[PDB]
Write an enzyme that holds these catalytic residues in place. Structure first.
Site, PDB file in Angstrom:
ATOM      1  N   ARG A   1       0.800  -1.196   0.000  1.00 29.97           N
ATOM      2  CA  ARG A   1       0.000   0.000   0.000  1.00 29.97           C
ATOM      3  C   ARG A   1       0.838   1.253   0.000  1.00 29.97           C
ATOM      4  NH1 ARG A   1       0.510  -1.199   5.827  1.00 29.97           N
ATOM      5  NH2 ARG A   1       0.537   0.891   6.819  1.00 29.97           N
TER       6      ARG A   1
ATOM      7  N   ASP B   1       5.421  -2.940   9.568  1.00 27.96           N
ATOM      8  CA  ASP B   1       5.403  -2.228   8.306  1.00 27.96           C
ATOM      9  C   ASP B   1       6.836  -2.129   7.792  1.00 27.96           C
ATOM     10  OD1 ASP B   1       2.635  -1.723   7.680  1.00 27.96           O
ATOM     11  OD2 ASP B   1       2.658   0.285   8.563  1.00 27.96           O
TER      12      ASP B   1
END
Lengths: 139, 139
Positions: free
Chosen positions: A95, A128
């Site tokens: 993303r 992440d």
């Protein structure tokens, strides 16, 4: 912003098809809330959150503090999820997060690949991966 | 080197259980060859390779050139794969690559989450996500 050329419709966000994928998808979309109290409800007691390879936060209190602190200096203006998928208990999101530094007004596009581990629908681990060269400046 | 606290046996490298996963696992292990000619054999003609968000290489010629260039300045000393999984035609590797800068002899640990797309057993896309602020110095 716009769809990258390597984006595969086979794994598009809108094609999310397990309950974990749908939970994670809902979670990363909720990041634009900039609300640590809202976000922390998605987490298990025994949990972790890390921007690799910065020091991790373990435990729901530490995670909540980390998010709360983030949202004092930064606004998550947008999250665009290109892929979502899952495998062996892990959920993956490819993303872009758009972050805006509150003191400067400057915004930053981070290309992120995140991995989530859920236990009974609650986040047990969230890591992440992305370039941190501008993340420092964005504080 | 050491297994992280968040490593999950259910998605361990030793448990790879699809042809794509096994191919991808074999590919990342082969990185320690530092051999672009060997490594390019894994890629389709229509392909890409990117260290996010540096400029991508599209096409097998550009990928080979990029790998060749890399291995003239850097040795991939070790690759340790913690997780491998796959979903919707994508394979994910959560891993650590140890790179040694050839002119300085300095080594670096990069925490990497990589995504691979395969077509008929050949790499159609490879995007690695990791912190790049030592990468600049490393390469």
């Amino acid at each position: 912003i716009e769809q990258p050329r390597w984006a595969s419709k086979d794994s598009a966000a809108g094609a999310a098809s397990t309950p974990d994928e749908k939970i994670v998808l809902e979670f990363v979309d909720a990041l634009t809330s900039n609300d640590a109290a809202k976000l922390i409800e998605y987490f298990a007691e025994d949990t972790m959150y890390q921007n690799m390879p910065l020091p991790p936060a373990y435990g729901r209190d530490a995670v909540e503090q980390t998010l709360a602190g983030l949202f004092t200096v930064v606004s998550v203006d947008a999250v665009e999820t290109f892929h979502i998928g899952s495998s062996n208990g892990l959920v993956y999101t490819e993303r872009v997060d758009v972050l805006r530094a509150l003191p400067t007004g400057k915004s930053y596009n981070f290309s992120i690949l995140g991995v989530f581990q859920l236990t009974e629908g609650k986040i047990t681990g969230w890591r992440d991966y992305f370039d941190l060269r501008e993340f420092e400046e964005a504080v």
